[PDB]
Design a protein around this nucleic acid. Structure first.
Length: 341
RNA sequence: UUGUAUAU
């Protein structure tokens, strides 16, 4: 299967082997764990001539290398370090194959790299081969990263077809493991006319989303980078449910984000809710201090509370200081209290 | 080591 040259190379016979020396063996070396490695760490520092010599032998069979466990790395280097003309010729070897490559283990990595370095016209042509297959790519283990990459790299205007495809399925995709990722990229890079409908659906299913294994990340994303209007809507869903949600493995993280990113008024209201409300005989704050997840919310509340409110929180915590030591999680609250005594 | 998500 291997040639004399590659054979002797594996056998560590050419410790000083150079690029020009493997002319006529590029494809063979490229599809070889050691060969590829060798080529990879030469193209970056090699000369334009050495790179063209390598390019000449991989252009025709480029697809073959793109979907190759070791070859995909060489093609990637050309997009990263190759010349404009080489990147363009590789982009043409990809034409008509975007979908199958995007769904490919190795191929999707080439597509992702190509999207970063080719011109907008080449990006738009690539993106368009995904037209009609958006959800399939989004739900694919390989394809979801190509979609994420398009959103990061391509002009928003050319991604309208991905937006049209998410309409009505935002809730479904936000609880999907790859989908929640694409939704976040959409919120960070797309246009107002595009993020608007996505946000409406996110607001409509906020209650379910905060508690979802994946949806909770999308809601936090909005609390951390969203417009104040959108943040307040999320906060108003949390209000009245601080106690119950802070005790939830998933929503607890969302109430922390609310505490941290709410407006001054909203923050005070959230903290007060658990400083006033009584959970049985003892306050809601006390039940929270003893919970495996809620204790984190209290600590965050102590951190962001205005000195006036922090004082109130400490006072509600005070009478319980000695009992807290007996609870697996209350203890952790004591630790936090050290920072303040 | 008090608590949740990405691929050769």
């Amino acid at each position: 299967g291997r040639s004399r040259l590659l054979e002797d190379f594996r056998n560590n016979r050419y410790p000083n082997l150079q690029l020009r020396e493997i002319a006529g063996h590029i494809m063979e070396f490229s599809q070889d764990q050691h060969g590829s490695r060798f080529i990879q760490l030469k193209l970056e520092r090699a000369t334009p001539a050495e790179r063209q010599l390598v390019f000449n032998e991989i252009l025709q069979a480029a697809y073959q290398l793109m979907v190759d466990v070791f070859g995909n790395y060489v093609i990637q280097k050309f997009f990263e370090f190759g010349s404009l003309e080489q990147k363009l010729a590789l982009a043409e070897r990809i034409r008509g194959h975007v979908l199958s490559l995007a769904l490919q283990m190795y191929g999707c990595r080439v597509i992702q790299k190509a999207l970063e370095f080719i011109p907008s016209d080449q990006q738009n042509e690539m993106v368009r081969e995904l037209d009609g297959h958006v959800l399939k790519c989004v739900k694919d283990q390989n394809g979801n990263h190509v979609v994420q990459k398009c959103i990061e790299c391509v002009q928003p205007q050319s991604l309208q077809f991905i937006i049209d495809a998410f309409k009505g399925q935002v809730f479904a995709l936000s609880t999907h493991p790859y989908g929640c990722r694409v939704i976040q990229r959409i919120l960070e890079h797309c246009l107002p006319d595009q993020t608007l409908p996505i946000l409406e659906e996110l607001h409509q299913h906020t209650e379910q989303l905060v508690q979802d294994q994946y949806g909770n990340y999308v809601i936090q994303h909005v609390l951390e980078h969203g417009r104040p209007e959108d943040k307040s809507k999320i906060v108003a869903e949390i209000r009245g449910n601080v106690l119950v949600l802070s005790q939830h493995k998933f929503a607890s993280n969302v109430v922390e984000k609310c505490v941290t990113h709410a407006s001054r008024t909203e923050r005070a209201v959230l903290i007060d809710e658990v400083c006033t409300m009584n959970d049985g005989p003892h306050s809601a704050l006390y039940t929270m201090m003893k919970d495996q997840y809620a204790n984190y919310v209290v600590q965050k509340m102590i951190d962001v509370a205005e000195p006036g409110q922090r004082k109130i929180v400490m006072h509600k915590i005070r009478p319980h200081i000695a009992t807290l030591r007996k609870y697996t999680y209350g203890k952790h609250i004591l630790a936090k209290l050290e920072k303040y005594y």
